[PDB]
């Protein structure tokens, strides 16, 4: 019988994920949960398809829907933090439903959220199911670099990066980045060892430290404004940015290690001049010397987030019970013809 | 984790690649070098002294005596870094197989030799099967090209086209390899009968990209209709100097060669790979690129700029040692292996 799959959340990501999972003949969508949006309608009609024979169910009824529909996995595409997804995780664990989530933090949440991660580990262990996640950060950043790093004899430094256009993420995300502003205490740009939530690059640094078998001393984030040598216009905050005014934000996560290996990753959200593009880069310094690195220009991150998730489904079902970080998994399941 | 005896490793060949591979394997505490074979070069000297190191207690042995050396030294694997073709390495493969020694080779063709050399590959498969050992290879083409793309391709829902590429400086590969890529030829000389540009259904050996195409077709579970190669000379808008042929290359004279391998498939998937070997002008760099077209639609690709390919060839090989020993007997293409063994601190 095909894998029984729930879509937990049905916004931008799981709408697109649904189109692909409908085509997959090794999968059967058994449930699609939203909060309030589209809640009476057939999920296929929502996304421009023929009726599928399954209705979008409500957030409040999640636990009952997961009990009666008997999914082996829920694709949790709701929120970013172990705290904010806790309620959805609990509904899954209590009904013996495995989870792959695209929640950024769950790339590696052990140090950013120690107690909430421990709780979710123990809960999934108790009901004998697995929690895994990270989406784009899991597959396109960490797993790509894990393959590349096999070709290193000695790593002294991992120097990695993620660049996105923050003007295309709405207000709220623009406000959380220094767009419009100019290091004050109540401005993001102030940071401390206790500040929460941590950046995506914080969780990626800990993923690498785990994969490379390193011992973390400290991961510190340093938040720095971006500027342009010319006047920009922001269509996010609706104002010109004069020269020397903040256009966006870099979070640089620096991990020091008892082995002397340095891990530096930059998260860059800014408005973009001529020539700026969305980017992933990973570079390894050591031996081989002079830099072993890859770049991805203009990655279709939204679609790739969903396919990474799809590549982890059977692995998540088959993983040991508990919170399993992706460094403990094999590579994303290989592309093969004949699944559609 | 209980102690395992160190892997017993032979270096079969001892030129540019295995000299550098030796320096790294000496540092690896999970490995014991048990033999280093050359043809004639350095035969009789201690392999450590050859490569600027303290005496290791192992002398460089001769090509003709390979079978005896592999019999008395009892290696579990031979790192075969000699020649490029399943035909030309046959005699070294036979020495290994008959002494139950597994092989990882950097022989370009053994990325995927099944269609470029059907009968010789079948023979080597059956020989390794009979002696219950594994033949695996491809070096830089295996790990940095095919395996990197295999990870990236997991992120595809549907692949319509793979568009891939490899660029290297042939002026740094000696006179013979420069001549094989047509450096210093006029275009007309380039396209003369059995010149570098000449191409036919009977042409042999095939390009590296030919074998990579078939690796992808195997990995993606596709059925090959035809792979054709098309050869094109490279030119430069200014005069270059070639160290390899030791003279100026006038404007419009061939600076090297592009081999484009195009594979069609019963599934409608197209696989196109370019091999570019030429003399560089200012701003030319060594490159790998792989791009996947389909769904996701917006272009799923990576580029590697300025890879240290010689050292990466060796580390790829090192990442395959335990896998090769562990693999089922026979000729095992790397699409049937897991990813290159992950980097982990504390092996040195
Ligand atoms: N890993 C990556 O690189 C990556 C990339 C893309 C997205 N993400 C993250 O993934 C998350 C989802 O993104 P998206 O674009 O799909 O978001 P979205 O469009 O905001 O969709 C959220 C969906 O989840 C539902 N939801 C929220 N809270 C819920 C709850 N308690 N119970 C049930 N359903 C609930 C929403 O219902 P309503 O419509 O009724 O609110 C909606 O259906 C975000 O946190 C985003 O940052 C990660
Ligand atoms: N897959 C990849 O990415 C990749 C990359 C680089 C190289 N390669 C290939 O690897 C091969 C070797 O490369 P290289 O740069 O190390 O070459 P090299 O400097 O020519 O060394 C080759 C070694 O093999 C020895 N040898 C040759 N035939 C032998 C035989 N029958 N028995 C024993 N030893 C033998 C040679 O001995 P003598 O010095 O005494 O003649 C030499 O020690 C070539 O085919 C090259 O094209 C592949």
Numbering used by the authors:
A (entry chain D): 8 to 189, 194 to 351
B (entry chain A): 4 to 351
Show me the paper's own sentences about this structure.
Native amine dehydrogenases (nat‐AmDHs) have recently emerged as a potentially valuable new reservoir of enzymes for the sustainable and selective synthesis of chiral amines, catalyzing the NAD(P)H‐dependent ammoniation of carbonyl compounds with high activity and selectivity. MATOUAmDH2, recently identified from the Marine Atlas of Tara Oceans Unigenes (MATOUv1) database of eukaryotic genes, displays exceptional catalytic performance against its best identified substrate, isobutyraldehyde, as well as having broader substrate scope than other nat‐AmDHs. In the interests of providing a platform for the rational engineering of this and other nat‐AmDHs, we have determined the structure of MATOUAmDH2 in complex with NADP+ and also with the cofactor and cyclohexylamine. The two‐domain structure of the MATOU monomer is similar to that observed with CfusAmDH and MsmeAmDH, with a largely N‐terminal Rossman fold domain (residues 8–158; 309–351) and a largely C‐terminal domain 159–309 comprising a seven‐stranded beta sheet.
